[PDB]
Amino acid sequence: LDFPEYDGVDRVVNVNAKNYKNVFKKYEVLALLYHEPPEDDKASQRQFEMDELILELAAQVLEDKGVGFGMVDSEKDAAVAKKLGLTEEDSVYVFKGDEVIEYDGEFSADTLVEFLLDVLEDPVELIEGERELQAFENIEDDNKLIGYFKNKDSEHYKAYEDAAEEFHPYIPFFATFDSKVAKKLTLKLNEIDFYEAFMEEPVTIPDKPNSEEEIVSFVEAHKRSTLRKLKPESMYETWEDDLDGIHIVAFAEETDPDGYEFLETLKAVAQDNTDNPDLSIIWIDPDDFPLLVPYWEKTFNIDLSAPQIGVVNVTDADSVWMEMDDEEDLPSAEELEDWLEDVLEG
Amino acid sequence: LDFPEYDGVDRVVNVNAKNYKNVFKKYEVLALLYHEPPEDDKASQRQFEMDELILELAAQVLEDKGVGFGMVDSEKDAAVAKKLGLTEEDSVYVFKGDEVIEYDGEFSADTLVEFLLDVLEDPVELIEGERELQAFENIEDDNKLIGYFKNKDSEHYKAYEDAAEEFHPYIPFFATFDSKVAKKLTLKLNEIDFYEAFMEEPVTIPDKPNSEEEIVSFVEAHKRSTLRKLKPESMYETWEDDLDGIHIVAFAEETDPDGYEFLETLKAVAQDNTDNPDLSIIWIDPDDFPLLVPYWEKTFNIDLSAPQIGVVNVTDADSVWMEMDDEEDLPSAEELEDWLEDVLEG
Ligand SMILES: [Ca+2]
Ligand SMILES: [Ca+2]
Ligand SMILES: [Ca+2]
Ligand SMILES: [Ca+2]
Ligand SMILES: [Ca+2]
Ligand SMILES: [Ca+2]
Ligand SMILES: [Ca+2]
Ligand SMILES: [Ca+2]
Ligand SMILES: [Ca+2]
Ligand SMILES: [Ca+2]
Ligand SMILES: [Ca+2]
Ligand SMILES: [Ca+2]
Ligand SMILES: [Ca+2]
Ligand SMILES: [Ca+2]
Ligand SMILES: [Ca+2]
Ligand SMILES: [Ca+2]
Ligand SMILES: [Ca+2]
Ligand SMILES: [Ca+2]
Ligand SMILES: [Ca+2]
Ligand SMILES: [Ca+2]
Ligand SMILES: [Ca+2]
Ligand SMILES: [Ca+2]
Ligand SMILES: [Ca+2]
Ligand SMILES: [Ca+2]
Ligand SMILES: [Ca+2]
Ligand SMILES: [Ca+2]
């Protein structure tokens, strides 16, 4: 009645020109680890075996749900990788229907399975009644969309659902057919509002009713939020998406009163500067990455039991941190704005 | 710049009558896995080696923070185990100061390290100003206490801090010296309010000012909340604490609009029946245990993409689940009360 342990059945194989058509046929959803060939030393061999074991456990856990896992060698299987669109080494590409979803997060069985379980869900969630509306409003650490349509047979709803599939499961798409919900949201019929992460005010997609292409192009242009949360499921995607080799990194434990107070200041600063295309802040809650906390404290020379904020230069592997005597020496929004300005324009 | 990998240094040893005094001296905080001797078959041997490797990784991660890990064989080391108070096999006993903290949760390096990082924090958190007060009010999935005292030198504050140590890190103790915060909480000087998990209304500890013993005895009597959340850090403690071999188990994904709506009904039912000593509901959010979701769906024969609630008989290894056609066929509070009554008084 406990966590599953690998049962030794070989379910994850190398996916190559000989078998790839049969593997895609065997599984309704197929997730492919695109990897460089392991080096020949024993350490690199062991790590490769341990990585495969992670996939084996996930494949066992999800067998009855139509999910399969495979591995594609970027050298041996280069031709198949190209035909399938596998280009970023160490990414897992998830094939659902007509979509190819890139996973670029923690390589662990639990996080992988949680992601696949999100992939298997439908790309549009409905909102009806006050409690469901409250659930929608509680979402803030993701970009989200909500649109008001006549009903599920509306061509405009179907275009919205088709657009949701492009960003699944990263950007939740919500829909309502309830005119009372739409009024509380100030959504006119066939209007779509995009709520950037951590923002209070939405941006309405122009020129409604909107086609799939109009929604997709809009979401792609607003995909990067001023403030974004580092999450295990997407940690490497976020970290690799630096702006001119610079991240602003804020550490704050949401549940701690001092972390909450600092996070509220951070949100206020992001909201007041949300249209500055050069501002990108990563919020890391230490409680989400316990195994990295000592490493971050050593690397950055900071105490993560208190809120911290700094500028990390990925190009030069260097960083500077705002000097805060303790948890009670937090900057005002204005002081935080000014400190970022001083370090960046410099 | 990534998750740590075990470096092969042996930091976790068997703790026995010969070395236990030196181990306790080597480490400021020491966590001891109390385990039955591994069976001699190769499978049991491998599992024991894999368990030790989990401790090795945690010990590496926390080395610079004064934490050590050890293992105590319940047969070979029975005399030392008794002297140290190790009685429940498969529990990890954490020695901090004068306290012995039992860990009875997921045996994984990340969850273990997160718990130890919580252990290392101070047992009382202060509340000052409106934002910190809001952080206090946002806490609902734990029992919590808050007391109003003159200042940190008050003998009554010191008694409160001494009591907090007994329940650290499971039941957060908050304190304020701010008369404006105390007024919003309706806390008179030296009063202590206990907020049961998921309850709106607190219970004031009687006969203030309160001694350590009065607080400890009060908290012990109110320790078990009507509604409690299954969490990795304490999942086995919670599951083993059944009431006459019965758990009421509710599955609800907090972030999903249907899960939120059902959870609100569950909270309302718990609040209206909070004084019924026979009512104990475990809320499991599937998003917290992805690796167990397929196992639960198979074992209970339910769809965990929708909210579910049932009665699980641990004695007879049997369960019954409320029949809900889909996510929109949710019971009212009254219907849920009546359904529990019908299945239990039967
Ligand atoms: Ca294999
Ligand atoms: Ca497409
Ligand atoms: Ca990557
Ligand atoms: Ca986990
Ligand atoms: Ca509007
Ligand atoms: Ca249009
Ligand atoms: Ca990527
Ligand atoms: Ca704090
Ligand atoms: Ca504080
Ligand atoms: Ca913005
Ligand atoms: Ca955590
Ligand atoms: Ca923590
Ligand atoms: Ca403060
Ligand atoms: Ca060892
Ligand atoms: Ca004691
Ligand atoms: Ca136990
Ligand atoms: Ca983890
Ligand atoms: Ca009161
Ligand atoms: Ca008293
Ligand atoms: Ca226990
Ligand atoms: Ca739903
Ligand atoms: Ca619904
Ligand atoms: Ca109660
Ligand atoms: Ca989760
Ligand atoms: Ca989920
Ligand atoms: Ca509903």
Author numbering:
A (entry chain A), B (entry chain A): 4 to 349
Q: What do the study authors state?
A:
Calsequestrin (Casq) is considered to be the major Ca2+-storage/buffer protein within the sarcoplasmic reticulum (SR) of both cardiac and skeletal muscle, where it resides as either its cardiac (Casq2) or skeletal (Casq1) isoform.
Low-Ca2+ native bovine Casq1 crystallized in the P1 space group and contained four molecules in the unit cell; the resolution of its diffraction data was 2.74 Å, whereas low-Ca2+ recombinant bovine Casq1 crystallized in the C2221 space group and contained one molecule in the asymmetric unit, with a resolution of 1.88 Å. On the other hand, the three molecules in the high-Ca2+ asymmetric unit of native and recombinant corresponded to one-half of a linear hexamer. Residues 350 through 354 in the crystal structure of high-Ca2+ recombinant Casq1 could not be modeled because they were not resolvable, which indicates that residues 350 through 354 are inherently flexible.
